[PDB]
Design a protein around this motif. Structure first.
Motif, PDB file in Angstrom:
ATOM      1  N   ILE A   1       3.569  15.412   1.341  1.00 51.83           N
ATOM      2  CA  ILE A   1       3.800  16.618   2.137  1.00 51.83           C
ATOM      3  C   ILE A   1       2.462  17.329   2.384  1.00 51.83           C
ATOM      4  CG2 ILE A   1       4.952  18.842   2.250  1.00 51.83           C
ATOM      5  CD1 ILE A   1       7.049  17.708   0.355  1.00 51.83           C
ATOM      6  N   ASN A   2       2.133  17.545   3.648  1.00 47.25           N
ATOM      7  CA  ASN A   2       0.934  18.293   4.018  1.00 47.25           C
ATOM      8  C   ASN A   2       1.205  19.773   3.946  1.00 47.25           C
ATOM      9  OD1 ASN A   2      -0.937  16.060   5.077  1.00 47.25           O
ATOM     10  ND2 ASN A   2       0.890  15.731   6.276  1.00 47.25           N
TER      11      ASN A   2
ATOM     12  N   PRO B   1      15.965   4.276  -4.578  1.00 48.59           N
ATOM     13  CA  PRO B   1      15.443   4.250  -5.933  1.00 48.59           C
ATOM     14  C   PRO B   1      16.190   5.171  -6.931  1.00 48.59           C
ATOM     15  CG  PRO B   1      13.636   4.205  -4.364  1.00 48.59           C
ATOM     16  CD  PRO B   1      14.909   4.425  -3.562  1.00 48.59           C
TER      17      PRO B   1
ATOM     18  N   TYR C   1      16.233  15.374  -5.199  1.00 51.29           N
ATOM     19  CA  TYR C   1      16.427  14.258  -4.275  1.00 51.29           C
ATOM     20  C   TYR C   1      15.257  14.038  -3.352  1.00 51.29           C
ATOM     21  CZ  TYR C   1      19.650  10.674  -2.492  1.00 51.29           C
ATOM     22  OH  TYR C   1      20.278   9.508  -2.100  1.00 51.29           O
ATOM     23  N   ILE C   2      14.131  14.728  -3.572  1.00 53.21           N
ATOM     24  CA  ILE C   2      12.907  14.465  -2.844  1.00 53.21           C
ATOM     25  C   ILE C   2      12.044  13.588  -3.715  1.00 53.21           C
ATOM     26  CG2 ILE C   2      10.877  15.458  -1.752  1.00 53.21           C
ATOM     27  CD1 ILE C   2      12.548  17.994  -1.198  1.00 53.21           C
ATOM     28  N   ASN C   3      11.728  12.362  -3.269  1.00 57.06           N
ATOM     29  CA  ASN C   3      11.020  11.431  -4.118  1.00 57.06           C
ATOM     30  C   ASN C   3      10.172  10.518  -3.267  1.00 57.06           C
ATOM     31  OD1 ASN C   3      10.385  10.238  -6.615  1.00 57.06           O
ATOM     32  ND2 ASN C   3      12.533  10.277  -7.274  1.00 57.06           N
TER      33      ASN C   3
ATOM     34  N   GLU D   1       7.498  11.346  -1.532  1.00 56.07           N
ATOM     35  CA  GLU D   1       7.019  11.996  -0.322  1.00 56.07           C
ATOM     36  C   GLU D   1       5.557  12.383  -0.399  1.00 56.07           C
ATOM     37  OE1 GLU D   1       8.882  12.777   2.866  1.00 56.07           O
ATOM     38  OE2 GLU D   1       9.173  10.780   1.851  1.00 56.07           O
TER      39      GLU D   1
ATOM     40  N   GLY E   1      15.897  10.498  -2.006  1.00 55.70           N
ATOM     41  CA  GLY E   1      15.830   9.808  -3.268  1.00 55.70           C
ATOM     42  C   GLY E   1      14.919   8.577  -3.279  1.00 55.70           C
ATOM     43  N   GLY E   2      13.954   8.571  -2.359  1.00 55.18           N
ATOM     44  CA  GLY E   2      13.031   7.462  -2.213  1.00 55.18           C
ATOM     45  C   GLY E   2      13.476   6.376  -1.240  1.00 55.18           C
TER      46      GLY E   2
ATOM     47  N   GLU F   1       5.634  19.214   9.712  1.00 57.53           N
ATOM     48  CA  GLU F   1       5.932  18.162   8.744  1.00 57.53           C
ATOM     49  C   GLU F   1       7.269  17.490   8.996  1.00 57.53           C
ATOM     50  OE1 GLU F   1       3.821  16.866   5.896  1.00 57.53           O
ATOM     51  OE2 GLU F   1       2.870  17.388   7.810  1.00 57.53           O
TER      52      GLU F   1
ATOM     53  N   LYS G   1       3.961   6.525  -4.572  1.00 54.14           N
ATOM     54  CA  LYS G   1       5.093   5.814  -4.030  1.00 54.14           C
ATOM     55  C   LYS G   1       5.629   4.739  -4.995  1.00 54.14           C
ATOM     56  CE  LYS G   1       4.444   7.197   0.681  1.00 54.14           C
ATOM     57  NZ  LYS G   1       5.839   7.520   1.023  1.00 54.14           N
ATOM     58  N   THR G   2       4.722   3.999  -5.612  1.00 53.62           N
ATOM     59  CA  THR G   2       5.125   3.032  -6.637  1.00 53.62           C
ATOM     60  C   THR G   2       5.904   3.699  -7.791  1.00 53.62           C
ATOM     61  OG1 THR G   2       3.412   1.468  -6.104  1.00 53.62           O
ATOM     62  CG2 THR G   2       4.225   1.437  -8.350  1.00 53.62           C
ATOM     63  N   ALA G   3       5.367   4.818  -8.241  1.00 54.53           N
ATOM     64  CA  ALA G   3       5.974   5.507  -9.360  1.00 54.53           C
ATOM     65  C   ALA G   3       7.360   6.031  -9.052  1.00 54.53           C
ATOM     66  CB  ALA G   3       5.069   6.580  -9.867  1.00 54.53           C
ATOM     67  N   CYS G   4       7.530   6.549  -7.826  1.00 53.51           N
ATOM     68  CA  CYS G   4       8.888   6.891  -7.345  1.00 53.51           C
ATOM     69  C   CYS G   4       9.836   5.711  -7.481  1.00 53.51           C
ATOM     70  CB  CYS G   4       8.797   7.384  -5.894  1.00 53.51           C
ATOM     71  SG  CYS G   4      10.396   7.374  -5.041  1.00 53.51           S
ATOM     72  N   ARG G   5       9.412   4.525  -7.008  1.00 55.33           N
ATOM     73  CA  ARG G   5      10.298   3.399  -7.078  1.00 55.33           C
ATOM     74  C   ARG G   5      10.669   3.011  -8.504  1.00 55.33           C
ATOM     75  NH1 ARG G   5       9.418  -0.620  -2.092  1.00 55.33           N
ATOM     76  NH2 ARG G   5       8.932   0.983  -0.569  1.00 55.33           N
TER      77      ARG G   5
ATOM     78  N   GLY H   1       3.705   1.484  -1.735  1.00 51.82           N
ATOM     79  CA  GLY H   1       4.483   1.393  -2.935  1.00 51.82           C
ATOM     80  C   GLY H   1       5.143   0.043  -3.145  1.00 51.82           C
ATOM     81  N   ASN H   2       5.254  -0.369  -4.413  1.00 47.55           N
ATOM     82  CA  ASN H   2       6.072  -1.541  -4.766  1.00 47.55           C
ATOM     83  C   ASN H   2       6.208  -1.548  -6.277  1.00 47.55           C
ATOM     84  OD1 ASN H   2       7.479  -3.916  -4.219  1.00 47.55           O
ATOM     85  ND2 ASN H   2       5.660  -5.197  -4.528  1.00 47.55           N
TER      86      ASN H   2
ATOM     87  N   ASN I   1      11.317  13.685   4.116  1.00 45.52           N
ATOM     88  CA  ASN I   1      12.493  12.904   3.759  1.00 45.52           C
ATOM     89  C   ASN I   1      13.172  13.491   2.537  1.00 45.52           C
ATOM     90  OD1 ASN I   1      12.238  10.469   5.644  1.00 45.52           O
ATOM     91  ND2 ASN I   1      10.276  10.437   4.551  1.00 45.52           N
TER      92      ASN I   1
ATOM     93  N   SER J   1      -1.073  -1.439  -5.631  1.00 41.46           N
ATOM     94  CA  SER J   1      -0.856  -0.454  -4.561  1.00 41.46           C
ATOM     95  C   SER J   1      -1.966   0.562  -4.460  1.00 41.46           C
ATOM     96  CB  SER J   1       0.520   0.252  -4.729  1.00 41.46           C
ATOM     97  OG  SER J   1       0.574   1.092  -5.873  1.00 41.46           O
TER      98      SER J   1
ATOM     99  N   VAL K   1      -1.887   8.221  -3.310  1.00 35.93           N
ATOM    100  CA  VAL K   1      -0.640   8.106  -2.532  1.00 35.93           C
ATOM    101  C   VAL K   1       0.087   6.799  -2.811  1.00 35.93           C
ATOM    102  CG1 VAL K   1       0.348   7.998  -0.237  1.00 35.93           C
ATOM    103  CG2 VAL K   1      -1.376   9.731  -0.742  1.00 35.93           C
ATOM    104  N   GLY K   2      -0.642   5.681  -2.863  1.00 33.02           N
ATOM    105  CA  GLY K   2       0.019   4.413  -3.185  1.00 33.02           C
ATOM    106  C   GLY K   2       0.664   4.480  -4.555  1.00 33.02           C
ATOM    107  N   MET K   3      -0.006   5.063  -5.544  1.00 31.53           N
ATOM    108  CA  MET K   3       0.567   5.102  -6.877  1.00 31.53           C
ATOM    109  C   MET K   3       1.795   6.027  -6.905  1.00 31.53           C
ATOM    110  SD  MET K   3      -2.592   5.110  -9.590  1.00 31.53           S
ATOM    111  CE  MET K   3      -3.123   6.791  -9.232  1.00 31.53           C
TER     112      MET K   3
ATOM    113  N   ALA L   1      -3.925   0.722  -0.900  1.00 29.48           N
ATOM    114  CA  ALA L   1      -3.968   2.003  -0.212  1.00 29.48           C
ATOM    115  C   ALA L   1      -5.390   2.512  -0.147  1.00 29.48           C
ATOM    116  CB  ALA L   1      -3.076   3.059  -0.904  1.00 29.48           C
TER     117      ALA L   1
ATOM    118  N   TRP M   1       0.821  -1.217   0.000  1.00 33.07           N
ATOM    119  CA  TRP M   1       0.000   0.000   0.000  1.00 33.07           C
ATOM    120  C   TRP M   1       0.839   1.243   0.000  1.00 33.07           C
ATOM    121  CZ3 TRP M   1      -1.760   3.779   3.820  1.00 33.07           C
ATOM    122  CH2 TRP M   1      -1.174   3.699   5.049  1.00 33.07           C
TER     123      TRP M   1
END
Lengths: 245, 245, 245, 245
Positions: free
Chosen positions: C237-238, D207, C231-233, C235, D241-242, D235, C165-169, A146-147, D238, A154, C161-163, A158, A144
């Motif tokens: 952020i509120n 990542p 280098y922020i990936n 995340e 880079g993931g 907040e 994070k997946t997309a970052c990876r 990420g993967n 991070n 995911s 949010v799940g997508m 989520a 949820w």
């Protein structure tokens, strides 16, 4: 012994795998169990439970169709009385990288995993809020957050977490708890095809140093379903031996 | 019945309040219980458990002093055998706004809540890792993610969460689980002086619509302490009826 | 000044509200902006940006249809060159309690908010991974961790949010960052339309003591879109003045 | 250009490493920078900034001592005027497994990392709440959610997150934001000193596929310090880079 004596539970996706281990533990604690699945092996699953002395029934159901979910709940209640516990375990994968994921593969996974869980939660909520008691336990996934290859999966899992939390806010005052479990890496009859090299990588991510069993998930379900867990609501509990995906 | 039969538990801060309710539930499930506290009422707490049929002993201890924590564990084990379960519940508050918090009030809260929990975890870890089994359950707080007036208390309880997670990574492969519970708003013998208006505001934040009891926390502790929870490790579980602080 | 000079950005749902404030800030920083929306007011939005000296264009699009998303990206690139930045802000509400939510209202919200965001992310990913650079910024919601009446909306935004994070990876190694922003309570026409009692309750939940502006969301988008944020990936952020929903 | 023109910043622990990269970026954006450190190389750090055209001064300070933190702030303000921005980066490691960590090594890490950060936050808060404006940016660590060998360090950095969130709740209505950054694996002289196997393992967890630079952390600090980030409060961001530790 008998924490769930004569409670009625529906477990979706319970013909095999994590869901069948959940069903086993609920039955061990005295619940009468409806195995809801499309897989015809569900009948053999229910028979295995019956052979051990539990009351169980298989109901063939596609949870993506509202009319079938309505029928599932009506039939479950005709057989075993009011549904006290719903476990939303049913889930499928159609993995693909984000740049390659077909629309059909997107649609199928959202329909089963996310819409199907909504439809079942809805039928439970209509009933449980009138009765003033209930348990809804959603099985999400370590994916949820990420993967790789799991844009659809995911998203779906989520989304289940978001619904879990919403449902807690709406239903807690009616005496219902709604919680989610995220299994880690669990070795079951549905993971017999994982290559050795892939298992090694997975095991290296688990502080406990071993893959869990379906019954580990089941023990957590059975606790959340119990009267003792009345004050746990809206939680997402990892059952993973410390594993961070 | 008897999920913790034959096991021995130390519960710190268990003379009153949440800690005493934890001790009651562990005793109900068959554990022999050491009440570790500075409060002399700990003897009456242990006597109450004994009167109910359990094995329990009070050991006076200041958990901020390493020599006393060493003595606690040695005495506990001389009386009741190997300590299978440690519950770090002891905690104090010395609240103040960030701009007003005295150094003494800072120091006191970190010393008890954070250092004391470390010292007890360390004595448990030394033993449990050699024996190949164990349970450490830390009681953190809903305040770990911030609360007005609680710079010191939030620091201390967030720090407990970080240690919980570290300890899981180090100890899981040795057969130990380390988990944290964050109680929500719990009504106990230690909250009898909360004004009515303040209770109303608190209750308005709880989806369940009522304040929990110390035994609600205890039920979750008892599950985590059980063999059934062997694959739950490094988790932070809220017991709060859905409340977000 | 000019952190995004001659970058091309698509902002979905940018005719009004949060999305238009995002568009304003990106244009202030030098991006050429495609306002992608179903709302015909998108033309007036694009005209407002042009009147200030920015290059902007309105493209009418329903992001739930893959063919329309494909056309959006092709048209955007014909006008302004390669798309450097995608901001997925488009979303709808069809709120209802879990026990009352119609299937159509479920379906529509998932189709726009979740599937539509996937389809746009996919078109961006196909291009950005080949070019070796890119920014994808998803606007989720404070509701992703639950909100009364928002089973469908919370599902959809947690799914985003799940997508993310997946997309970052999948995409980080290609020089692309994928991040999400959760606005808090932002002063827009939509939030000004809640009942007075709800407005007061919401302001009481914001430590800052005021509702934010669409441009506050825009400032965070513009930072994440910049080279400085390479280098922020992955995340979330509120942008909410400390508000916890 | 010049997002922080006319502002004065204190960066603790800025003689080397991540803190020096923070100082570089704040200076690039026009802040006058106080390097506060125990390390005498702080003078060379401040001289390097001056050689580049910035206003910078080194003040020797052990942040574990309240009197030294009071003197730091008084001297900083005599030299450069009101402190607009505090960056708490100072931290030490004395790593050891839980079962081996000496009391002295526990004590020293908590005293610097946690108490020292509190003492600095307190001096900033006293001033900023009266002035009606301010920025407090705490550098935590990826270790705040656990890391083998870091019972003390993880305690300290999770404790910093708790205080961050508390401080947001107290200070937001006074015009101050309080936020935390968790660097990932950043290429510094300290990370280049790890064993070869550990370096390789860490890169495999990122990542983005490379270790970040101190200036990447600095870019996020500079955004949070800016007027544009007025509505971001409480907040934990991070910069990794993931990477998931």
């Amino acid at each position: 012994s008998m924490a769930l004596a004569s409670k009625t539970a529906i477990v979706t996706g319970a013909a095999r795998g994590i869901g069948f281990g959940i069903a086993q533990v609920l039955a061990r604690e005295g619940a009468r169990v409806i195995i809801a699945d499309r897989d015809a092996h569900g009948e053999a699953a229910a028979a295995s439970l019956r052979e051990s002395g539990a009351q169980a029934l298989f109901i063939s159901c596609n949870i993506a169709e509202k009319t079938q979910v309505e029928a599932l709940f009506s039939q479950a209640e005709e057989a075993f009385g009011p549904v006290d516990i719903l476990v939303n375990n049913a889930g499928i994968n159609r993995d693909a990288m984000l740049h390659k994921l077909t629309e059909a593969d997107w649609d199928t996974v959202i329909d089963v995993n996310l819409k199907g869980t909504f439809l079942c939660m809805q039928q439970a909520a209509i009933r449980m809020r009138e009765r003033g008691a209930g348990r809804i336990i959603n099985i999400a996934s370590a994916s949820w957050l990420g993967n790789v290859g799991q844009t659809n999966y995911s998203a779906s899992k989520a989304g289940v977490v978001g619904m879990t939390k919403t449902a807690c806010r709406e239903l807690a005052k009616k005496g219902v708890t709604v919680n989610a479990i995220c299994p880690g890496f669990i070795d079951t009859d549905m993971t017999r095809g994982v290559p050795e090299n892939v298992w090694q990588i997975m095991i290296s991510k688990i502080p406990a140093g071993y893959a869990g069993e379906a019954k580990d998930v089941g023990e957590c379900v059975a606790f959340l379903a119990s009267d003792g867990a009345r004050y746990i609501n809206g939680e997402v509990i990892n059952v993973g031996g410390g594993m961070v995906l």
